Amino acid sequence: LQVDIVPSQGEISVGESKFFLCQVAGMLPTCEISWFSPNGEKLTPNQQRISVVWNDDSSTLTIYNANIDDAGIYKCVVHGPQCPRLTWSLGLPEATVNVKIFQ
Amino acid sequence: TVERSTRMSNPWKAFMEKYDIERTHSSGVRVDLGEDAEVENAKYRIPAGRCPVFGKGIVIENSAVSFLKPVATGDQRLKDGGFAFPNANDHISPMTLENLKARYKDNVEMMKLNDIALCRTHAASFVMAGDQNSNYRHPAVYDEKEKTCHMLYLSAQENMGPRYCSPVFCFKPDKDESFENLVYLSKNVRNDWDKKCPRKNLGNAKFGLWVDGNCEEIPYVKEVEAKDLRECNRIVFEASASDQFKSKGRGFNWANFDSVKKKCYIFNTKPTCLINDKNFIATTALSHPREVDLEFPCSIYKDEIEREIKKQERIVLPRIFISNDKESIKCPCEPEHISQSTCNFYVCNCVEKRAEIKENNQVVIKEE
């Protein structure tokens, strides 16, 4: 159970939009992906500016129409009842992406 | 009508093949990371040794949970739980021998594998669909007393250091009483390990070097205190080949245990024969920590000498100057008897030896 965000970094500008894919290799039965904003709010598939998409063992973070208040590090956590809470590489079952806005 | 052959052969060739750890194991022993594997563009290092490691386990510092229990899942603590695969269905791991034979009752080619080989075949035959998993397969630990097969979620074996073990899930491979019945298995362990890989210790024996017609003592070794065979097996294991670059099986993998003097002599050169000594036990890093086989192949020399004489005006005696039959040697002088020999061997020393050991346990010919 490993997780990675592609792209790994985000060089966004104000107004532009950027997508981030979180893919988990080694998904075991009870595992599920969840995104978290810089402030720690769990992002649900809402019809809002910053939303999330569920696509097979992956989950995409779409940041439409960017603004300066969106910058921060977003977390993608693979959690579950019977889901490993440790990566094959003795790492946490989560991945981070640092998005930075400009002008 | 009788002369001594010029071909210098070693009758221990086939017997000692399983102790060529570099050739038969071909990977690290203490810390096995012989093969690299990528998974969806993510480099990894996984064990690759082809021989089982009897008595090996993982000791977790500042913890009181066996590394064979599953990893923490969901709302468990990280410090809680071990290295094993998540037991959420109890169908991937652990798996008893009865459940293994039952799940493969129709696979004829698998119902012919031994217990350890069946556990290994099961554990390495797991790949989640939808993932690259290019040669990334999990290792296993088979408990021969519990008859249980455990898949390992974590392939790491040692994570010591000033950061991880200082005021953090620290672990190290080791051998102790609790692991004596375990068999550490990588994804590449030979199914025919019973004949190709070491297991039981060799009693009344000590590893030596075959010069020309006799097994001589290994000059360069490192002596260590050992109260019993188990500690000598633990000492050699801690000094064995370690991949913590790849070792490919090179390292201090062999040891001769003096049960009388209670000493443990380790070395890093592959052995080519055995010396029959009632006071010594030959052990390896892969061998069981306690099982000992006391039957020394006494007729190995006599059987080979008689074989050549049967294949043949004149008789060409092989270059074997040791035997439990004093006549077969046909010594020009009186052979010397070995008091500590369980086989009652006799050696002929008044002979021109065509080989010689010097430097770092290397056997070289003087003149061709």
UniProtKB/TrEMBL annotation, chain B:
Keywords for this protein: Glycoprotein, Membrane, Merozoite, Signal, Transmembrane, Transmembrane helix
One Gene Ontology CC term in the entry: membrane
Keyword Phosphoprotein: no
Cystines in this chain: 51-197, 119-149, 165-170, 215-273, 232-264, 298-343, 331-348, 333-350
Main location: membrane
Official protein name in the record: Apical merozoite antigen 1
Membrane topology qualifier: Single-pass type I membrane protein
Full protein segment contained here: 44 to 469 of 562
Compartments it resides in: Membrane
Domain of life: Eukaryota
Family from the record: Belongs to the apicomplexan parasites AMA1 family.
